[PDB]
Coordinates of C-alpha atoms in Angstrom, one line a residue:
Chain A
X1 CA 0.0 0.0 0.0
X2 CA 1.4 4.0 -0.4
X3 CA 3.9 3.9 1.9
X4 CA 5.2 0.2 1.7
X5 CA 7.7 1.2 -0.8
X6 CA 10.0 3.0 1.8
X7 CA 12.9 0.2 2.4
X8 CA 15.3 -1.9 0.3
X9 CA 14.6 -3.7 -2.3
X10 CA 16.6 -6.4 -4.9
X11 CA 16.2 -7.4 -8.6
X12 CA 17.1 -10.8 -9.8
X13 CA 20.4 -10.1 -10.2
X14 CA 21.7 -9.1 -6.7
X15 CA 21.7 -5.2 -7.1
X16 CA 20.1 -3.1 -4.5
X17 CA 17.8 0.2 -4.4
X18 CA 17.5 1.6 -1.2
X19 CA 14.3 4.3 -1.2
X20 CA 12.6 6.8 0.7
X21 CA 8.7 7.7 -0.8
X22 CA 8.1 11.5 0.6
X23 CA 3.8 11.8 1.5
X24 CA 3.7 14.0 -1.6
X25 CA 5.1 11.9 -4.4
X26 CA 9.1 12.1 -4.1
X27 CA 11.1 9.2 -4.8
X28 CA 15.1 9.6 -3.1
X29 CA 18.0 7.0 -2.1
X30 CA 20.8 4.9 -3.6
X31 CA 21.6 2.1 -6.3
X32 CA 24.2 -0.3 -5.9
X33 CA 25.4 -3.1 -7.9
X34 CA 25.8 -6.5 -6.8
X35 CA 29.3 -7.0 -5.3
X36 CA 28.1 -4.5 -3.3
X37 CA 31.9 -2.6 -2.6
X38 CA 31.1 1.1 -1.3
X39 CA 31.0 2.8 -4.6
X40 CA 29.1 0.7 -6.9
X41 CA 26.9 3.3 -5.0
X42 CA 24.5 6.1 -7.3
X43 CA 22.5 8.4 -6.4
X44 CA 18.9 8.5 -7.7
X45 CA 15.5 10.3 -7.7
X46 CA 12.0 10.3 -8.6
X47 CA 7.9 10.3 -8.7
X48 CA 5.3 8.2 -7.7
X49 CA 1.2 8.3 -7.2
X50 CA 0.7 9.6 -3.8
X51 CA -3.1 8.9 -3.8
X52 CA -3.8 5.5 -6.2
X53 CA -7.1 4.4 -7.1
X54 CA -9.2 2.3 -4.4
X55 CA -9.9 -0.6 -6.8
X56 CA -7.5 -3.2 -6.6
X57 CA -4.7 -0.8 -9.1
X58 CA -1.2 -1.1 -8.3
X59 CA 0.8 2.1 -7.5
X60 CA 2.5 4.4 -10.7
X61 CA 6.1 5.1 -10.0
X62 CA 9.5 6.4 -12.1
X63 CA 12.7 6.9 -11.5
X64 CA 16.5 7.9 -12.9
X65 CA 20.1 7.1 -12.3
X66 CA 23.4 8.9 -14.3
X67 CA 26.3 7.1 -14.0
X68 CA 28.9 9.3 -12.6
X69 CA 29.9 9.4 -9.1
X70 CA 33.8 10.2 -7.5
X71 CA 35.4 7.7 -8.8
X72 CA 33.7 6.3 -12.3
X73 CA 31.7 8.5 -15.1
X74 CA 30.1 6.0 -17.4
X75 CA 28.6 8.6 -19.3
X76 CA 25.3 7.4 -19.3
X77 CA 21.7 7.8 -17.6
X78 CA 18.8 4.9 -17.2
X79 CA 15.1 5.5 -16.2
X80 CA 13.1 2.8 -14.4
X81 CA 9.1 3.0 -15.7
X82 CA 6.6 0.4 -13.6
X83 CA 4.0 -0.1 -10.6
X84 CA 4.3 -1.0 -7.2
X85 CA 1.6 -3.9 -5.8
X86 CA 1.3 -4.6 -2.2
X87 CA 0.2 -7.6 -0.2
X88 CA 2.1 -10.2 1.7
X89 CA 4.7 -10.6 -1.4
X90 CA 5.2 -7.0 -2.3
X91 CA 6.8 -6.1 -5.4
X92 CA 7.9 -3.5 -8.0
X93 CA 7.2 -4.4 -11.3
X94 CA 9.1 -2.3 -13.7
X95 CA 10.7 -2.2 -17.7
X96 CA 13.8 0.5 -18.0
X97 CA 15.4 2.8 -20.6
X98 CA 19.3 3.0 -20.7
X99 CA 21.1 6.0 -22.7
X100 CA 24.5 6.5 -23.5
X101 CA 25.8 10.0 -25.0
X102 CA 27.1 9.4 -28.4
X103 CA 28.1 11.1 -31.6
X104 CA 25.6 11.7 -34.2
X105 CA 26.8 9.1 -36.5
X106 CA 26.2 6.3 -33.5
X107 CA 22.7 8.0 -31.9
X108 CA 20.7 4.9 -33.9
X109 CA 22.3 2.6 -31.9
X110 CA 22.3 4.2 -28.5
X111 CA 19.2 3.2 -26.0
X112 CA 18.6 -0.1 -24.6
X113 CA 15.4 -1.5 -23.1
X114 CA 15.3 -4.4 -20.6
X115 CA 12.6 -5.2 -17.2
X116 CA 13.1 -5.8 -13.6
X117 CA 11.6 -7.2 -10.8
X118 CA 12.4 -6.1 -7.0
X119 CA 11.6 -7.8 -3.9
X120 CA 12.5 -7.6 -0.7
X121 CA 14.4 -11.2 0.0
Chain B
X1 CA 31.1 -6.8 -15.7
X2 CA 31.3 -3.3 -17.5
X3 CA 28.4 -1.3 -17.2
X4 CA 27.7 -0.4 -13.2
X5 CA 24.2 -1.5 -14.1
X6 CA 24.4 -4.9 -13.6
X7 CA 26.4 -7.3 -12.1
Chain C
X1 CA 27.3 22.0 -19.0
X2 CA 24.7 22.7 -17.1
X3 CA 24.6 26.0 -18.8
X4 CA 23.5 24.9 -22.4
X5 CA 20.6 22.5 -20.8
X6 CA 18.7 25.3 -18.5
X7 CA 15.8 27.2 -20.3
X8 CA 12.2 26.6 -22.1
X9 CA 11.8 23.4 -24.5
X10 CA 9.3 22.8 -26.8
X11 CA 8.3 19.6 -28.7
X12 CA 6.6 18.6 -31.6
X13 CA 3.1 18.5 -30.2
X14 CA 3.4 21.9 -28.5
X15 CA 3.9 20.5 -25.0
X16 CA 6.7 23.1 -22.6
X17 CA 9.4 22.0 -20.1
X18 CA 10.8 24.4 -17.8
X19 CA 14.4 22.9 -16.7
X20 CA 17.0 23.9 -14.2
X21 CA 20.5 21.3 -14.1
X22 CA 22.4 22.1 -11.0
X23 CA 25.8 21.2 -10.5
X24 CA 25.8 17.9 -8.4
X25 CA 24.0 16.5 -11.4
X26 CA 20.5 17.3 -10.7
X27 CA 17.4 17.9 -12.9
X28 CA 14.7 19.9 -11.7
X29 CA 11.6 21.7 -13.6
X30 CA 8.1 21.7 -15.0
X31 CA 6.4 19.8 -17.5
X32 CA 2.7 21.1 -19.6
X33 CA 0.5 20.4 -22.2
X34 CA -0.2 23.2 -25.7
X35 CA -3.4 23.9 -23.7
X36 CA -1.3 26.1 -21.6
X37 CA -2.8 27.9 -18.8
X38 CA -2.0 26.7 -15.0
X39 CA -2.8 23.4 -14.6
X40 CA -1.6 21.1 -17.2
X41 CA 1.8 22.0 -15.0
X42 CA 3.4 18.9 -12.8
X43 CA 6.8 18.8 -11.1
X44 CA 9.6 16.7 -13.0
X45 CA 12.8 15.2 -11.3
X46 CA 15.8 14.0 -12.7
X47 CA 19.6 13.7 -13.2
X48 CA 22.5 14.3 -16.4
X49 CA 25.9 13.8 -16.4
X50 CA 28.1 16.6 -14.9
X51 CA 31.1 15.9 -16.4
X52 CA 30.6 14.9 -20.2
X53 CA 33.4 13.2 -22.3
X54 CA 34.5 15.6 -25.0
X55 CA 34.5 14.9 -28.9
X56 CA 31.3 16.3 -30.5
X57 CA 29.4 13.7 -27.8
X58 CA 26.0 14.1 -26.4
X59 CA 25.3 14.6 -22.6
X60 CA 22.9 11.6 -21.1
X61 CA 20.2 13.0 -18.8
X62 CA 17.1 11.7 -18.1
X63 CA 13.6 12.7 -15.8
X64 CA 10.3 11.6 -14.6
X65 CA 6.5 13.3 -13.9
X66 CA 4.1 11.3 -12.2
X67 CA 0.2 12.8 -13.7
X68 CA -1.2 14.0 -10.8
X69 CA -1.6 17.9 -9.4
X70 CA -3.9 19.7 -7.3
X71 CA -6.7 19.4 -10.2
X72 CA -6.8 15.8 -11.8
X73 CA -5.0 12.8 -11.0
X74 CA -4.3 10.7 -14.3
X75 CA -3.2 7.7 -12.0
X76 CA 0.1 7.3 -14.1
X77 CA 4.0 7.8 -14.6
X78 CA 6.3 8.8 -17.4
X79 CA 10.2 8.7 -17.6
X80 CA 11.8 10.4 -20.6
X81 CA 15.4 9.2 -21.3
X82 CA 18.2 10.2 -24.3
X83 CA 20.7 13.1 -24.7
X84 CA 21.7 16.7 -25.2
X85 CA 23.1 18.0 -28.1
X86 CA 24.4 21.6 -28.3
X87 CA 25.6 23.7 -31.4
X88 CA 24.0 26.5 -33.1
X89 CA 20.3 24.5 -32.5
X90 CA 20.3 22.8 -29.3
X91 CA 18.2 19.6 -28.7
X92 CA 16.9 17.1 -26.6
X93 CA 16.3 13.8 -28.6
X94 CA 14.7 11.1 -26.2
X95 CA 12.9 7.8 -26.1
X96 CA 9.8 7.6 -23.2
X97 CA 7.5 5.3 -21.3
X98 CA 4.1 5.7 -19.9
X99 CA 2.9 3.5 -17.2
X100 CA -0.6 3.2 -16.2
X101 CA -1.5 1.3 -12.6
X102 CA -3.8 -1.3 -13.4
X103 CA -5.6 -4.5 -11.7
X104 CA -3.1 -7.6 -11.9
X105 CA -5.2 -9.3 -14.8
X106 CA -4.5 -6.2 -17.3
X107 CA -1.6 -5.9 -15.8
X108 CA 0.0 -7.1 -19.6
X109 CA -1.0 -4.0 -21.2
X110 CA 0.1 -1.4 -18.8
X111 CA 2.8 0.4 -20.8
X112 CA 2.6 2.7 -23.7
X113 CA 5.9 4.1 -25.4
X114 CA 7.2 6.3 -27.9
X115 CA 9.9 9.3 -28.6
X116 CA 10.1 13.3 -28.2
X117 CA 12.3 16.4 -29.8
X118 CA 12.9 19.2 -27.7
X119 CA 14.1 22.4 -29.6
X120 CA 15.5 25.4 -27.5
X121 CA 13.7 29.1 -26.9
X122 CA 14.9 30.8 -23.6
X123 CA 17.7 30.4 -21.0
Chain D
X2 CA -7.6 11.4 -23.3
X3 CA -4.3 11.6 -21.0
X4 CA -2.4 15.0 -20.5
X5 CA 1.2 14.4 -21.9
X6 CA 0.1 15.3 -24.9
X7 CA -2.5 17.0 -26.6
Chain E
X1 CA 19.9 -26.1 -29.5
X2 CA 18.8 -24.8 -33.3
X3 CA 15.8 -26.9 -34.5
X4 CA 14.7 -27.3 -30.8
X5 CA 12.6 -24.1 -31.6
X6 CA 10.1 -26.4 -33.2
X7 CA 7.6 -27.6 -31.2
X8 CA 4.7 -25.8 -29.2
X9 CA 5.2 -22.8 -26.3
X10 CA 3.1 -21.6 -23.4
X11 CA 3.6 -18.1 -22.2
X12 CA 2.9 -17.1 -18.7
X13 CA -0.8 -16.2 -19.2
X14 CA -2.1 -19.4 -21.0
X15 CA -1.5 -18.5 -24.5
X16 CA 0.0 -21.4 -26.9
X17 CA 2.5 -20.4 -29.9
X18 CA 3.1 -23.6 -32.2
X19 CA 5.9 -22.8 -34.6
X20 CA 8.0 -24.1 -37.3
X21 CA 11.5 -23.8 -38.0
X22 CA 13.0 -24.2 -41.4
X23 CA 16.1 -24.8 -41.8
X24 CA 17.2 -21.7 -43.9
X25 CA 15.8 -19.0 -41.0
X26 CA 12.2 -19.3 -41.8
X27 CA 9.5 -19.1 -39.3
X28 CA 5.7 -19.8 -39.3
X29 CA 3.0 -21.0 -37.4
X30 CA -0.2 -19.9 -35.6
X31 CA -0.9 -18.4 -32.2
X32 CA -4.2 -18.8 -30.2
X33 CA -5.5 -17.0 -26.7
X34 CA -6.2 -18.7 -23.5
X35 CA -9.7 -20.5 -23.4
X36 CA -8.4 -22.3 -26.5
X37 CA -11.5 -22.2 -28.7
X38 CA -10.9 -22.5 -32.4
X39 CA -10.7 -18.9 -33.3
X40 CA -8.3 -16.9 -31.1
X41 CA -6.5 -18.4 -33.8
X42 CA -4.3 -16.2 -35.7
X43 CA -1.3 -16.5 -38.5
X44 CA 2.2 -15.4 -37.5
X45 CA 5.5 -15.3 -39.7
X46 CA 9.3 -15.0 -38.8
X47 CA 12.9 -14.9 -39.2
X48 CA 15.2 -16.2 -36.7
X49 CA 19.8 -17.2 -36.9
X50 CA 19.8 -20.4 -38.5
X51 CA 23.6 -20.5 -38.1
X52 CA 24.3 -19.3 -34.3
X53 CA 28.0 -18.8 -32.7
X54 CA 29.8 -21.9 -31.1
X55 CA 30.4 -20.0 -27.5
X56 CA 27.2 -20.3 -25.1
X57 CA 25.1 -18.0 -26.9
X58 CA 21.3 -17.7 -27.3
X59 CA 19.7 -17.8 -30.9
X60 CA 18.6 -14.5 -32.0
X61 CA 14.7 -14.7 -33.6
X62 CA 11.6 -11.9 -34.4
X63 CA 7.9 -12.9 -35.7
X64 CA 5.1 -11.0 -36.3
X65 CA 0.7 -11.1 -35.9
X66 CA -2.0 -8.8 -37.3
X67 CA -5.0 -9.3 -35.2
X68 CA -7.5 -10.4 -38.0
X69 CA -9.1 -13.8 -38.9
X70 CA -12.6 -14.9 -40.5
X71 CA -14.3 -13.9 -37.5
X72 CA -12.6 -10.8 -35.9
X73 CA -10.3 -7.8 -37.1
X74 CA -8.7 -5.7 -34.1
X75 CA -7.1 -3.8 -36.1
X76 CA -3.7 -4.2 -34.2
X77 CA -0.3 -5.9 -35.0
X78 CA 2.0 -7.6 -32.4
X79 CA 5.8 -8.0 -33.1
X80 CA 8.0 -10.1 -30.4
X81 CA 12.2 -9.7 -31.0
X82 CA 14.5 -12.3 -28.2
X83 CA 16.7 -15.2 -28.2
X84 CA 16.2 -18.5 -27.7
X85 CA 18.3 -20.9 -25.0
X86 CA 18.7 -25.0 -25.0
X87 CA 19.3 -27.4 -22.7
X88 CA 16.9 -29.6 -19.8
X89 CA 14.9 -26.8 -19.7
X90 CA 14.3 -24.9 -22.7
X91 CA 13.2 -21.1 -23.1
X92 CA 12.3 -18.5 -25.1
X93 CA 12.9 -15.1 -24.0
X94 CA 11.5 -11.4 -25.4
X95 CA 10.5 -8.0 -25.5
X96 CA 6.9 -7.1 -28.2
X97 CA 5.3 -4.0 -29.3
X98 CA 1.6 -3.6 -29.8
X99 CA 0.5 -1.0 -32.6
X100 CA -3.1 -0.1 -33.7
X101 CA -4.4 2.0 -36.6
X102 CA -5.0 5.1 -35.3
X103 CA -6.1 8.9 -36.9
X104 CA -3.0 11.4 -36.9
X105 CA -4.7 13.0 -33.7
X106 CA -4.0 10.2 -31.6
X107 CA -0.7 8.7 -33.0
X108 CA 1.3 9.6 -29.9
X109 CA -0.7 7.0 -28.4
X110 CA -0.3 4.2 -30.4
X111 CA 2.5 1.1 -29.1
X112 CA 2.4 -0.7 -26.1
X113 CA 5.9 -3.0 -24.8
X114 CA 6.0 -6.1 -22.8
X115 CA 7.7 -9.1 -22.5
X116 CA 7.0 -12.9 -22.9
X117 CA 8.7 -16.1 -21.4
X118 CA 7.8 -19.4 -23.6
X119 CA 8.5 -22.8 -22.2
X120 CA 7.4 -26.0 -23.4
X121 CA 5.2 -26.2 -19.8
Chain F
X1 CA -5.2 -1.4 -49.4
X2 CA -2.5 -3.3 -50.0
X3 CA -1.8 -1.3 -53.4
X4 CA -1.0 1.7 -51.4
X5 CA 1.6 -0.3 -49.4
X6 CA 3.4 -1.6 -52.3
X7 CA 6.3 -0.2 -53.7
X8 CA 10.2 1.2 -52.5
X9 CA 10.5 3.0 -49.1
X10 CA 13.3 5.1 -47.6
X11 CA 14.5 5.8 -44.1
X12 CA 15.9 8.8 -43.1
X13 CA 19.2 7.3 -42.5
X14 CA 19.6 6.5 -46.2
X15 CA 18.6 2.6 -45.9
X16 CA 16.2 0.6 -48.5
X17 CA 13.0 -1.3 -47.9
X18 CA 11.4 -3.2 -51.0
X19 CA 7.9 -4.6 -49.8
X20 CA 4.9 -6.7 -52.1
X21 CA 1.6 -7.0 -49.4
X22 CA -0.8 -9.9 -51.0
X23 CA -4.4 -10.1 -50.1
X24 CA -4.3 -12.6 -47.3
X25 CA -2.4 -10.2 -45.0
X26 CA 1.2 -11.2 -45.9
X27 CA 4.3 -8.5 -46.4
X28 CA 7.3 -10.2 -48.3
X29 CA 10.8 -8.0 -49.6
X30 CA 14.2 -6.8 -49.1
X31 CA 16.1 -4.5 -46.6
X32 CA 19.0 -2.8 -47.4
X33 CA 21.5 0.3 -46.0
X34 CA 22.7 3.3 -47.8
X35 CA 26.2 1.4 -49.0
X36 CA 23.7 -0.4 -51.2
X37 CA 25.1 -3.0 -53.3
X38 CA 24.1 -6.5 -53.4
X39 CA 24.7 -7.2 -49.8
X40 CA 23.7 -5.6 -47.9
X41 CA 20.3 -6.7 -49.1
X42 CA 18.5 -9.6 -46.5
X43 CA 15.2 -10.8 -46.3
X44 CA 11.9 -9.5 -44.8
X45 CA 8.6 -11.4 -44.1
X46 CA 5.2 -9.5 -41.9
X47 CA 1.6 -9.0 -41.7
X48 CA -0.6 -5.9 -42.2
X49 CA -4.3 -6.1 -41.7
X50 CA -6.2 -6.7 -45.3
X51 CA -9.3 -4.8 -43.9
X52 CA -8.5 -1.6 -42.2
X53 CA -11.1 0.5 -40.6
X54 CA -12.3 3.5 -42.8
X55 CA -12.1 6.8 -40.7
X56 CA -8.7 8.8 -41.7
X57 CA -7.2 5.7 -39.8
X58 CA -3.6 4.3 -40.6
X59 CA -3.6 0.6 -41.2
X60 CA -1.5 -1.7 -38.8
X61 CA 1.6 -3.6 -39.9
X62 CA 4.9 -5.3 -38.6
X63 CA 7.9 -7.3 -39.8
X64 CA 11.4 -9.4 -38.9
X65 CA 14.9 -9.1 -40.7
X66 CA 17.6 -11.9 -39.1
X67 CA 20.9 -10.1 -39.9
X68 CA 22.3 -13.3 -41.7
X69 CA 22.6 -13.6 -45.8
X70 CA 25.3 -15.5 -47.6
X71 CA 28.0 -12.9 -46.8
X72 CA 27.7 -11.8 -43.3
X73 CA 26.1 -12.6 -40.0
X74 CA 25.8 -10.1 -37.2
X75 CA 23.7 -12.9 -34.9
X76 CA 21.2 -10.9 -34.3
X77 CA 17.3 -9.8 -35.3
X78 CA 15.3 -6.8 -36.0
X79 CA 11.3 -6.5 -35.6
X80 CA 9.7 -2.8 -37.1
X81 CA 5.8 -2.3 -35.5
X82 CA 3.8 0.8 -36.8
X83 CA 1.4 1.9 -39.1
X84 CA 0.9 3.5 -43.1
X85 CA -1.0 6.5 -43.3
X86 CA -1.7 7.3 -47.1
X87 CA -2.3 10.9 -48.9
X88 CA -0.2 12.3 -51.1
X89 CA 2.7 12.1 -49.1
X90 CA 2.2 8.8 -47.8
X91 CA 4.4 7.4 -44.7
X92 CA 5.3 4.1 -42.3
X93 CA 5.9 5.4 -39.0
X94 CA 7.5 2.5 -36.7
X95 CA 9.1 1.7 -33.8
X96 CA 11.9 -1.0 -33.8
X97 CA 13.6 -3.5 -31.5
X98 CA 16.8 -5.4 -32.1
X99 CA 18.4 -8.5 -30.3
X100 CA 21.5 -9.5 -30.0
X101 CA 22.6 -13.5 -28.8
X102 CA 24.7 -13.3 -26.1
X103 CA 25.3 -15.7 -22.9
X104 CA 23.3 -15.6 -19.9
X105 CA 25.6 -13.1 -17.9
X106 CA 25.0 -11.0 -20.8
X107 CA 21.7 -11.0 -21.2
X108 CA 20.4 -7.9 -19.8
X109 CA 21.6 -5.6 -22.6
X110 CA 20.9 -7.6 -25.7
X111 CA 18.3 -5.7 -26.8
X112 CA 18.1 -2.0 -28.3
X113 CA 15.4 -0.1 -29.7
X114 CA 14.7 3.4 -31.8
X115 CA 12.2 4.5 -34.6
X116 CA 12.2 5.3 -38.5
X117 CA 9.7 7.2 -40.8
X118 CA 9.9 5.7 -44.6
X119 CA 9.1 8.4 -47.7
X120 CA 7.9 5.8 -50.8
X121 CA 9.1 6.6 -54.2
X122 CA 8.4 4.1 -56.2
X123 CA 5.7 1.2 -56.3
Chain G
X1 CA -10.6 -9.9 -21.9
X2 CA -11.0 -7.7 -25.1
X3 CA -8.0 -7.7 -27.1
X4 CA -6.9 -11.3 -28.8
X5 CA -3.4 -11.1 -27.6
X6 CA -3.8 -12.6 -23.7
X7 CA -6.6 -13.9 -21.9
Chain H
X2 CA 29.4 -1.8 -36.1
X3 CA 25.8 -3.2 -37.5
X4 CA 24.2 -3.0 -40.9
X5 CA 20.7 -1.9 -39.9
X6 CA 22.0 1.4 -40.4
X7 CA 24.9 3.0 -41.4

């Protein structure tokens, strides 16, 4: 429900997201890939629906990551697009764009697509 | 590994 | 820079973003429809690369609005996500994704996709 | 009719 | 491994995908809705590698359906692109996008994207 | 109408799509890029919808190149999913997704996707 | 249900 | 490089 999406969740392949859901629909914390070393570590931030419909919808959320911090630059940026369903197995259910900056000559060739599921074990 | 995305 | 990406953008359907890039990487601004007026404006978050390799490269960057303000609620999200590209015309070339909450059975047909140009008019 | 665009 | 592709699929919602594979890259077949009845039948066509690399890579396929038969016309079309892996437990994993005829007004609104994973289940 | 589909479309990028539609809904041709020549050339096969719904609507298609002729192979495959709108300046508008085989550490980026607008010039 | 694809 | 596009 709402407010279930404050803590720490995983995708299937070990990396973590770590967020905060303000009452008024902002989305703050951390991404981290699996490993886990202290700087895998990215900031991110977002939006979500602070008051969903009250049949049983799931709950409309977004968020970004660029991937520069102080020690890599990977000049690059991915957005995370999805809904977030509560119950005794919560999850995130999301699909994600990931940009890279390129020359004009290679912009055809430079967004991928891929999904992700996050859960809490 | 080579993309901090993943892995 | 964050210089070349603050101002007004405009797209091909006549929707405005209003965008401010601080220096720690941060994206912050409002998105509205060609009808104009007050609200058809919602609050947009996101994040580019600071420090952008050089060559004749774009910068990454990419933001979301969730559809709800103090006068509808549209009950979804929508994340835009490409690059900047700064000369003589400036532009914003990006892919996006719309995602409405639904019921788990129509859960399959949730997402809607598609792409935007942003061309420059004001710091 | 949604309000992204027009 | 190649010609394994032939044979007949289940997605995760019920839905059954028998296909043929030539052996020159073709790919045809028909695809029906859950509930089964004899028309949710519709035609689909393909390409997919019909000579894949040697290191443990997935085989690269594509096939499209138009959502008309003799007794319905959505007007829509439905285009899944993926790969498919061997072994004890065989699978076929992609992305689609869902198009339908629209007027110029509401073009922007046109394509929906998911994904699909077929087992033999 | 599967007249009005018929014919030899370009892409803005310079690249060559030669397409027959026959009246049970199939779409059979070549695709080729700008270099031109023989090979560059690989086949296409899709489906359109034979009946399309009067209005000013555009009429539904899709279709698959594998990136594999007797010359090269890239191991992977491309799917296009849009729409033709006719007039005098008539247009396919689409969407594309390509996949790459890679191992199962890998598989997370295999797939990329973009769009393309074809001009006809020719049936 | 009211599209052919699922369900 | 790829030969969708050049």
């Amino acid at each position: 429900a709402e407010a279930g999406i404050t803590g720490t969740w995983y995708n299937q392949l070990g990396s973590t997201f770590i967020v905060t859901a303000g009452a008024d629909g902002a989305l703050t914390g951390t991404y981290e890939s699996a490993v886990g070393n202290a700087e895998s570590r990215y900031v991110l931030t977002g939006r979500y629906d602070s008051a969903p419909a009250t049949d049983g919808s799931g709950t409309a959320l977004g968020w970004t990551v660029a991937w520069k911090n102080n020690y890599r630059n990977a000049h690059s940026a991915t957005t995370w697009s999805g809904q977030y369903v509560g119950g005794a197995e919560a999850r995130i259910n999301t699909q994600w764009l990931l940009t890279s900056g390129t020359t004009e000559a290679n912009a055809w060739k430079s967004t991928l697509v891929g999904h992700d599921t996050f859960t809490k074990v | 590994f080579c993309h901090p995305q993943n892995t």
